């Protein structure tokens, strides 16, 4: 539930927000995309698993963790996306094609959105372009993200949280620097006003020899969390791998339906054929001779047309879309 330096905020500019996307994945054949942010989805304050609500960073000087519900999160690239699942840092969602991806949290009028560029194109499988999986068609081998949230595409490492400096912990009065920790909290302070000097103060505390607040820093001794190795956070010195969590929504194998293009009409002339073809969408026709030279040809076709293809005594083979290979032998 840390904060990342999102490049594009709600308004126009970069900010530091809980909802920074720091990586995006779209290799799934069905168009589903896996997203990675700094929030913890499906978790309450203590981290207990509960789908209905999630936890995230809080815009306050104590910077505790505060929580919200599923219904107020939205995802969109060009039009609104549909959430397919969520766990911890990661989301899975189905999105319309677009050039960027945006995640927005809507706490009433507080609509905090983070946007990151990523070209997501409508992708298909098979040898025929199609908008939608056909109701009827061949069941061909495909690979798509598994909706099971307990799966694992891998593992990501996390480390002890690094520094989190503040100047609200500091205060200037009559050209003197004081540290004001939150009530009952031991806050680690360190400063250099000439000599370098460190310490921990749990209460309103003076420091001497200091006239500028820029020379001193204070921050909580917060080891009670684990943070992803993000580039947007200055790091703890002991950056050993202190935890490995799974990468849900493994890219699993399955079968997908793909369309069946028009059955060609063969029109034959001496040592050659004339295939009359219809294909509303881009369909791949490939051919190859069966002699010493394949002379293989490939072509993506739309509309209706006709192709004259010489066939020799050795023969010819062609595949029209997802149909089976067809072989011929001339005389």
């Amino acid at each position, epitope marked *: 539930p840390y904060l990342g330096f999102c490049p594009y905020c709600r308004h126009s500019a970069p900010c530091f927000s809980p909802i920074k996307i720091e990586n995006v994945w779209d290799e799934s054949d069905d168009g589903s995309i896996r997203i990675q942010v700094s929030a913890q989805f499906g978790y309450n304050q203590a981290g207990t698993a509960d789908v209905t609500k999630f936890r995230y960073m809080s815009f306050d000087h104590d910077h505790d963790i505060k929580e919200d519900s599923m219904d107020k999160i939205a995802i969109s690239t060009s039009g609104p996306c549909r959430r397919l699942g969520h766990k911890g840092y990661f989301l899975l969602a189905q999105c319309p094609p677009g050039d960027s991806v945006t995640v927005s949290i809507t706490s009433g009028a507080s609509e905090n959105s983070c946007t990151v560029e990523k070209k997501i194109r409508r992708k298909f499988v098979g040898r025929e372009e199609y908008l939608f999986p056909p109701v009827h068609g061949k069941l061909v081998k495909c690979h798509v993200y598994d909706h099971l949230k307990e799966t694992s595409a891998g593992y990501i490492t996390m480390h002890r949280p690094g520094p989190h400096a503040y100047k609200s912990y500091l205060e200037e009065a009559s050209g003197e620097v004081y540290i004001k920790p939150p009530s009952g909290k031991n806050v680690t302070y360190e400063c250099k006003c000439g000599d370098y000097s460190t310490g921990i103060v749990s209460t309103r505390t003076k420091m001497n020899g200091c006239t500028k607040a820029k020379q001193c820093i204070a921050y909580k001794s917060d080891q009670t969390k684990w943070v992803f190795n993000s580039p947007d956070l200055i790091r703890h010195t*002991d950056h050993s791998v202190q935890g490995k969590l799974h990468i849900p929504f493994r890219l699993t194998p399955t079968v997908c339906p793909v369309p069946l293009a028009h059955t060609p009409t063969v029109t034959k002339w001496f040592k050659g054929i004339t295939l009359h073809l219809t294909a509303t969408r881009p369909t791949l026709l490939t051919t190859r001779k069966l002699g010493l030279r394949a002379d293989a040809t490939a072509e993506w076709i739309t509309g209706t047309t006709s192709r004259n293809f010489s066939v020799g005594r050795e023969g010819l083979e062609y595949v029209w879309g997802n149909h089976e290979p067809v072989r011929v032998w001339a005389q």
Partner: antibody
Amino acid sequence: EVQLVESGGGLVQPGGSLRLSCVASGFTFSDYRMAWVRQATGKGLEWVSTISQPSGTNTYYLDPVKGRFTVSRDNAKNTLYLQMHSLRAEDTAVYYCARVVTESRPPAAWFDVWGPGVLVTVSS
Amino acid sequence: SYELTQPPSVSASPGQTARITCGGINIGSELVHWYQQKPPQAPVLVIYANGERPSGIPERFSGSNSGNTATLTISGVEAGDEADYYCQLWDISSDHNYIFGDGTRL
């Protein structure tokens, strides 16, 4: 070569005073915090005092040695100093003058270079 | 004030791995440092910052710290590893005190 060499120790009566010297070489004496650390015979190492850098404005001491033992430094001759007053029997020990390497965030201090040490004995 | 406790002794024939533990309240939240001593020679730092070492320390030495326990792990013990070992930390809330452990012999 980075080397720290102690001197000045020996036998002293209880209630006496002494001045331990430690000359430094091979590094910028003014750039590093320094310390005196103690080891009694058959006991563990125990920290005595630290003097900061470059001017040594802030000096830190162990609780019983406050008000009696004083650290000082001089960057011109690169020499650390510990003056002792009102010496007592348990001060009998070997002292190492130690260069201090301090890392800002998280605040952490560990000693890198030590001298061979010098013995003081406090007995009647 | 933190109290550092180590076992008074650990016995290890050569060839295997030896673990020496430093115990203290909530020491996992701070950075421990392990020093090795052959009396009367001055000790030598072998671990600092819970996971990393000065130059020249062989690859067999490793350190860890978590919760209430820090651990010095020495794989493939040899005769030369027989030494005193002291865990260290810098309790800065206690007026910049440098607290050492009681010690452990190998």
